Amino acid sequence: GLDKEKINKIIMEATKGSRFYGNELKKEKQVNQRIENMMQQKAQITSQQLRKAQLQVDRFAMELEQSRNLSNTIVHIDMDAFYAAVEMRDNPELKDKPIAVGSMSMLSTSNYHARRFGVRAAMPGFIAKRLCPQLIIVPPNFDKYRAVSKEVKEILADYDPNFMAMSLDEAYLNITKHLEERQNWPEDKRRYFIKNSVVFGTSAQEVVKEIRFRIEQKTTLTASAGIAPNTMLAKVCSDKNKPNGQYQILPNRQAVMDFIKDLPIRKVSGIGKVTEKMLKALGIITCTELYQQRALLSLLFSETSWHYFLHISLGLGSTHLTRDGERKSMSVERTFSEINKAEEQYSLCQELCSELAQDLQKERLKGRTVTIKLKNVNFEVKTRASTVSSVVSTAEEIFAIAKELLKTEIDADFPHPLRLRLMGVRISSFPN
DNA sequence: ATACATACC
DNA sequence: TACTGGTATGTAT
Numbered sequence: 001g002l003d004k005e006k007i008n009k010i011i012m013e014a015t016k017g018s019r020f021y022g023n024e025l026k027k028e029k030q031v032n033q034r035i036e037n038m039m040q041q042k043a044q045i046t047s048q049q050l051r052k053a054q055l056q057v058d059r060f061a062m063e064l065e066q067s068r069n070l071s072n073t074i075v076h077i078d079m080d081a082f083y084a085a086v087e088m089r090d091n092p093e094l095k096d097k098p099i100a101v102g103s104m105s106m107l108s109t110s111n112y113h114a115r116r117f118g119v120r121a122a123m124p125g126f127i128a129k130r131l132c133p134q135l136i137i138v139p140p141n142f143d144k145y146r147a148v149s150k151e152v153k154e155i156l157a158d159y160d161p162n163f164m165a166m167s168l169d170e171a172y173l174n175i176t177k178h179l180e181e182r183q184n185w186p187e188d189k190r191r192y193f194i195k196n197s198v199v200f201g202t203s204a205q206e207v208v209k210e211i212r213f214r215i216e217q218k219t220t221l222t223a224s225a226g227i228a229p230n231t232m233l234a235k236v237c238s239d240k241n242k243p244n245g246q247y248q249i250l251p252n253r254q255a256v257m258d259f260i261k262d263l264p265i266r267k268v269s270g271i272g273k274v275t276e277k278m279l280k281a282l283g284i285i286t287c288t289e290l291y292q293q294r295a296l297l298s299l300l301f302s303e304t305s306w307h308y309f310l311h312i313s314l315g316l317g318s319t320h321l322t323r324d325g326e327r328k329s330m331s332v333e334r335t336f337s338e339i340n341k342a343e344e345q346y347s348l349c350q351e352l353c354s355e356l357a358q359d360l361q362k363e364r365l366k367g368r369t370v371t372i373k374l375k376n377v378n379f380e381v382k383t384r385a386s387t388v389s390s391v392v393s394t395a396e397e398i399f400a401i402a403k404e405l406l407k408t409e410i411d412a413d414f415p416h417p418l419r420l421r422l423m424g425v426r427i428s429s430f431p432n
Numbered sequence: 433a434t435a436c437a438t439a440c441c
Numbered sequence: 442t443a444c445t446g447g448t449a450t451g452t453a454t
């Protein structure tokens with residue numbers, strides 16, 4: 001498959017000049033400035049501050065290190081090319097062919113064949129077709145994916161009944177308890193037939209082989225898996241042998257540190273495009289560099305960020321799955337071809353409010369904060385929020401609040417019309 | 433509390 | 442022709 005410059009070449013040539021690209025520059029500059037600002041303060045940092053922080057951080061680091069929990073076994077399962085794999089399963093014509101699930105405007109994912117051409121999730125179809133004109137863009141069938149998801153979630157329930165579904169295709173499992181019961185199971189209880197039988201051992205490696213086997217037998221789709229003593233690690237491992245493979249970080253401190261040693265921080269869940277580029281500008285790329293700079297980082301970043309970075313640098317993370325409690329927000333948003341007539345924008349706001357009210361009606365939810373989201377034709381995004389004393393829920397009450405927030409924004413630019421491409425409404429601040 | 437940014441599927 | 446929908450969290454004021 002294609003190189004890796006030829007790709008970015010095509011994307012640039014196709015993106016450059018678009019209102020969309022304009023905005024991406026506007027953001028990258030707003031980030032570069034944020035780096036430059038950080039960069040200053042690093043210069044104004046003294047050696048006797050550095051020493052002061054270093055003795056503080058290490059005091060906290062000894063507290064984390066002494067509390068390290070290796071006694072749990074955490075599994076992250078992540079379906080392989082989920083949507084695309086499903087559409088491949090049920091249409092032989094795509095057998096050995098590059099595909100992507102989505103529209104010509106936007107793609108959800110792509111199969112590994114198509115990923116060799118640099119077509120990826122969150123790419124517009126029309127750009128992906130320039131990277132690979134044989135690409136088959138198959139429309140998404142959300143409802144199938146939900147149904148397939150339910151089939152695997154049923155299997156996963158056997159090993160951890162409190163497993164944490166992150167989305168349709170992925171989940172964390174705490175198999176610690178299952179491995180204890182399984183230690184002294186007969187071959188009967190861990191024997192599965194092929195769709196002539198097969199058997200799996202008593203170890204963690206084997207349990208996960210059984211899970212991934214049953215998943216393939218039930219759904220005709222492969223999954224990858226990661227094993228570790230915490231979620232943060234397990235999530236990373238699950239990606240290591242993708243597609244259709246496992247990895248284990250064994251529950252001993254040395255192994256953890258061996259894995260961490262040269263791990264690019266980007267691979268950790270929650271270090272993205274920006275934090276990478278920010279941490280790179282301090283010379284931090286691996287998770288040991290992140291450890292080494294821990295004093296400096298305590299001065300340049302907020303408490304939560306450097307606390308989080310320290311957990312990353314020590315190979316720490318969550319060692320029990322907290323059963324997802326109540327939601328914090330519900331929202332709906334929609335992109336469209338340009339709208340500028342005020343009366344059409346009110347109507348469209350009123351529609352979204354109705355849809356949100358209907359989704360609230362499902363889970364019997366009422367909130368206090370209504371937040372409209374507007375994104376003009378140049379991709380610039382405004383949110384405007386208003387909190388109310390008493391909780392609201394109906395399409396009328398939500399619209400009443402959103403109406404004004406929108407009105408204000410139409411008035412502000414007056415006599416210029418709001419030229420928007422996306423509107424949304426969110427409700428939040430639900431009671432405890 | 434409000435705004436905007438960053439991240440994940 | 443065409444650049445998503447969605448929830449939670451962070452950063453800053």
Ligand SMILES: Nc1ncnc2c1ncn2[C@H]1C[C@H](O)[C@@H](COP(=O)(O)NP(=O)(O)OP(=O)(O)O)O1
Nearest residue numbers: 078079080081082083084108109121122169242441
């Ligand atoms: N940015 C995005 N926008 C829309 N849909 C997306 C998306 N990212 C993912 N999806 C959809 C499409 C995906 O099928 C599904 C699961 O997301 P993953 O597990 O992150 N990606 P996959 O399973 O395809 O491949 P593998 O894990 O082997 O790399 O969510």
Ligand SMILES: [Mg+2]
Nearest residue numbers: 078079169170
């Ligand atoms: Mg995934």
Ligand SMILES: [Mg+2]
Nearest residue numbers: 078079080169
């Ligand atoms: Mg996946």
Ligand SMILES: [Mg+2]
Nearest residue numbers: 266268270271
């Ligand atoms: Mg990351």
